Amino acid sequence: GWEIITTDEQGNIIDGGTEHYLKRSSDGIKLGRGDSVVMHNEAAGTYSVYMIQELRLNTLNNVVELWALTYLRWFEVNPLAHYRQFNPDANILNRPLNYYNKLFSETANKNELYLTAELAELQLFNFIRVANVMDGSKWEVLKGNVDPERDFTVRYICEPTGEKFVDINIEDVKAYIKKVEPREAQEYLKDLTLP
Amino acid sequence: EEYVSPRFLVADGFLIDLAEEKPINPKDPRLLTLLKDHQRAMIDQMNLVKWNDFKKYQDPIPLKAKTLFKFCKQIKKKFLRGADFKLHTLPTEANLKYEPERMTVLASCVPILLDDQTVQYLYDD
């Protein structure tokens, strides 16, 4: 129940002979490069969020591959790595490893996501809803009026293992992702977390 | 109370999944995907409630489990409340036996999906 829409740089192209996005027949949800989606994740037993990175039309197939960049949710952070980074005198620790689990779980904003450079193929039948992913400032605006099921904030890209946090402007990332070549885009975001 | 990872809380002999805000069978195959070695080790040394002991209880399950009810999403379900305030399952048909002291009540509880697709309910007495 999803349609494919192809356009030049602006107007649509007909079927009879270039950007791709998906449109839902039901309401008119548009999904394309830069949009974030909440996805059912059967293996994790909880939902995941991604930013769409490429709608690869697979002439290999006559089928559509929806590739996206994976967000981390709070519980996928490495709480020791996070603490040690943001407390420099906390690479010399003395606490139990489980204290760091309690501390992170208890103080983290559960709707703060962390970008990663890791791609996933997403299947449309697992799509739950569009994510509203805003930067740290836009998130101060909304504080007492956020919907914990749609509304998310991002401050960092980091490694898929939940460490090495680097400040990013998420709104700048969306615009970058919808401009440059996917392969170039992913490889650049991959370099953002390396010494 | 032990936070064996940022997602998983052990408290009151229950494993609590803090993303889903709900208890997990410690024997849930899904943990083979989610737990690290050291975290599985912790749980095995931890002495948890066996979810199988629930299987043929016909009424809901009363608990002293403060942390569990604090961190878990609850639904309201229709039950019969006795004179002692224990909840009992509603018979989905006429039961006939005079019980004037048992009354229909909408009570807060925590649903758990059992091994065999049977649903149980935990509540604090």
Swiss-Prot record, chain A:
Per the record, what about its domains?
The N-terminus is dedicated to mating-type repression.
Q: What does this protein do?
A: Component of the origin recognition complex (ORC) that binds origins of replication. It has a role in both chromosomal replication and mating type transcriptional silencing. Binds to the ARS consensus sequence (ACS) of origins of replication.
Q: Which family does it belong to?
A: Belongs to the ORC1 family.
Range of the intact protein held here: 10 to 214 of 914
* Domain BAH, first and last residues per copy: 29-169
Please give the organism. Answer: Saccharomyces cerevisiae (strain ATCC 204508 / S288c) (Baker's yeast)
What is the protein's given name? Origin recognition complex subunit 1
> What do we know about how this protein assembles, alone or with others?
Component of the origin recognition complex (ORC) composed of at least ORC1, ORC2, ORC3, ORC4, ORC5 and ORC6. Interacts with MCM10 and TAH11.
Q: Which gene encodes it?
A: ORC1
Taxonomy, superkingdom: Eukaryota
Q: Where in the cell is it found?
A: Nucleus
Note, other:
Present with 3930 molecules/cell in log phase SD medium.
Curated annotation (Swiss-Prot), chain B:
Assembly and interactions?
Interacts (via OIR domain) with ORC1 (via BAH domain). Interacts with SIR4. Interacts with CAC1.
Mutagenesis or variant effect for residue 51 to R: Abolishes interaction with ORC1 and SIR4
Q: Where in the cell is it found?
A: Nucleus; Chromosome, Centromere
Q: Which domain of life is it from?
A: Eukaryota
| Outcome recorded upon mutating residue 109 to R | Abolishes interaction with ORC1 and SIR4
Primary role: Involved in the establishment, but not the maintenance, of heterochromatic silencing at the cryptic mating-type loci HMR and HML. Is recruited by interacting with the ORC1 subunit of the origin recognition complex (ORC), which binds to HML-I or HMR-E silencers, DNA elements that direct the formation of silent chromatin at the mating-type loci. Establishes transcriptional silencing by recruiting the three other SIR proteins, SIR2, SIR3, and SIR4, that function directly in silenced chromatin and establish repression. Also found in centromeric chromatin.
Q: Cite the residue spans of the region called ORC interacting region (OIR).
A: 1-125
Species source reads: Saccharomyces cerevisiae (strain ATCC 204508 / S288c) (Baker's yeast)
Name of the protein in its database record: Regulatory protein SIR1
